Write a protein that binds this ligand. Sequence first.
Ligand code: NA
Ligand code: NA
Ligand code: NA
Length: 228
Amino acid sequence: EEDNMAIIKEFMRFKTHMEGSVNGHEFEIEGEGEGRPYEGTQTAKLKVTKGGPLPFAWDILSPQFSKAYVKHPADIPDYLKLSFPEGFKWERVMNFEDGGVVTVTQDSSLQDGEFIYKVKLRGTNFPSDGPVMQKKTMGWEACSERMYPEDGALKGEMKMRLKLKDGGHYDAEVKTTYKAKKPVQLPGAYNTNTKLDITSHNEDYTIVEQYERNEGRHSTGGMDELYK
Ligand code: NA
Ligand code: NA
Ligand code: NA
């Protein structure tokens, strides 16, 4: 929309704060990021500010650090962009295959021309000798999130696959609800294709940089809607 393209510029910065705990270990992270919301790309630079070094895999946190930066076809309402400047909230559950659980709540707003993200995380039930608490993971596979409208919100479901250092994958089933603070136009069902990379980190993962690409694609409509 015109007013929304006026405030969600083609280059946007963000600030983020997470406070969480994993298996009872409390921590805080601050970060800053930047990206191109209409091109689907962003980077972030995170710093552990309390509770470091973290005694678990950074990879369970990386997907919690920004769907305002999803490239959308013009004919798919970009609900999360349209939610600004008030913004949106999201809530997520991740069920990992060994019984570990992460749940997340998040607030996204726009202040002084930058996005402001506030993340709260609670991770529980990870086995002590499992890949999360033993730091045996090596980043996510690319993922397609199946998006669909329901009861006034946007929901996404995905199977995320964490690569394991000794081979194979450690899987999570994930469901997220995204809901604008004000009613704006919901899309139909479509897919968000994501690739999230850790581009650098220090030895103990107290300093981390990430890159993600996110693009919405039609899942119906055939060749006409392919690459729209
Ligand atoms: Na970028
Ligand atoms: Na852009
Ligand atoms: Na626990």
